[model samples]
Target chain A: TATVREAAPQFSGQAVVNGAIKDINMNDYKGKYIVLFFYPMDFTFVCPTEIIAFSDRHADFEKLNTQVVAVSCDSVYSHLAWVNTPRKKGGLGEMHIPVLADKSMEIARDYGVLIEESGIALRGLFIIDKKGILRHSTINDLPVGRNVDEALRVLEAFQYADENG
Target chain B: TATVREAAPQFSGQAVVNGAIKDINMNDYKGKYIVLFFYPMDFTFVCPTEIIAFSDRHADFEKLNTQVVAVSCDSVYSHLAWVNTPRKKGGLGEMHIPVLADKSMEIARDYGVLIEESGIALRGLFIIDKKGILRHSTINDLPVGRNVDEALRVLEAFQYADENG
Candidate 1:
């Protein structure tokens, strides 16, 4: 599992964003800040609310030259369907950031979020600096949802630290 | 791998349809006919055309009480992205039928469609009758796309044989 201040594990695979499928290479986002978060599954409760919140604040991350990516063991199709589904029906309804498919569970396992017995991932988030070094991390149990505002605040703190210290 | 007259391999997993993720169990569709096909990956050439073609003609299959399902080793996210993507941009642009995610490749291997070395499934299609018996099957090499009309024709022929014989 990757740890804070350590080099984030390298990964590349398929992801869905704004209803489009594309190859996502972690290395491609180099030279820019990245906020990567992992959730349990798609088409379920709690997960979408957090994902949509992150999406709602996506422009803020983009302005900071930071890319946001969400992940889960769910397939890309699941992610897409959830995005297309209306919020009233418990769907994300069009998200801005890329939602990665960790179908193989390799990504989740590498990030130490996978629950081996359940075949799902816990809520795990990581902030990687422009140098590809992980700067911060957080994990939550399945029932607990995440805070998007806190994530943004953490990113800002990291940016501030890098510039001053 | 499954063959004619053999019981089709059983599988259950997540699937995407009309931008919604749902649990799909092969046994659930046991009373009706099934047209199951596998493609290589999402967001690639030829795959979407066939998937969309199947979706466009989904009503015809429904008339025969047959359900159409498309499978790929790609994650569900990839499937959703492709579905959301426009036809001109190599996306399926919202399909009517379920697109399955076989990220583990177990289903592909059971159907003998997996190209193990490549970690992708070959173009394989299976026609399963109401009794859960595999009535027909076909496998094509990469680059050769499938024909949606031919699949429906095969299903029709199967139904005819079952009724007349």
Candidate 2:
């Protein structure tokens, strides 16, 4: 069996509900593959571009027995408001996957993405296999938008690694 | 004067003292070139090999009028003690460079290298010119150590870009 790696620290935060977000145990994503990702903040310059791209590819992830999660240090209410906001205005409208509210930033600190001074997370992504083990992880500067296609490719590569090796 | 295309976030943190570690402000390196780098942790696997390599090349940096700073979330005391400890015992001794104690991880966040959940910094390096502009940066996975020569090459390349372009 291939040894599983913990690319970043495991996070436990509130879940999104009723346009409000609350902490959810990261263990919930255990047993199934997880695509854990982070964005700098809500209503930012380059964040929405990647968030929408990731949402557009949600169906493809579901087909591969994986789940996608987006997290930030922003409040759940803020996230919910943005989710309700229109895309043209730079808000992610009603994304299919959960957007974790990491206001406490414990989640961000654990993953080593938190800018403690500014209290925000950098653009970072992680791919974890079914066994609660981190398979691959990548991060970009705040100004550089994330790559959704590369994320899907990473998920597919992990699947291939799981099945073949 | 070279214009900053994308300036890295500003930060101030602890620095090294007399081959011992102590609190030094990040502003101290301003108006001077800085090559800020990070390793996962001290007294851990795969780190000593790389730390020694950088220490071996410390003079090369000074020759370029650039200061090298190695940062981790570890405390300044830890960094000091590690530098005082002998390399034979897997400690980074006698290397007189600032090993910053970024206990709050503000610096890592600024450099976009922290993995929050793990509270560990990924292998990230930044090339900041005299004006504190982040000219070049790179990140590596946990298991991989960075190449000092490549870092020097990047430093030189950036210098060339500044002179010619």
Which candidate number has the best TM-score? 1
Interface RMSD of each: 5.6, 8.1
lDDT of each: 0.80, 0.71
Tens-place lDDT per residue, model 2, A33-112, is 88877888887754487778878888988888888889989888788888888877877776877799888998777766
The TM-score each candidate achieves on chain A is 0.95, 0.88
Residue B7 displacement (Å), model 1: 4.9
lDDT of 1 by residue, A1-165 (tens): 888878988767778876877879998798888888898876553446788888998888987788888988766655766677678766788789989987677888888888865557788888989889899888998877789888889988989888897
lDDT of 2 by residue, B1-165 (tens): 111235656656776656754567757777667877888777775448766788779888887767788888888778878888887887887776778888898887666677788888877667777766666454554654566776676676566656674
All candidates' TM-scores? Answer: 0.62, 0.52
Q: Per-prediction fnat values? A: 0.05, 0.00
Q: How many clashes does each candidate structure show, in the order listed?
A: 10, 20
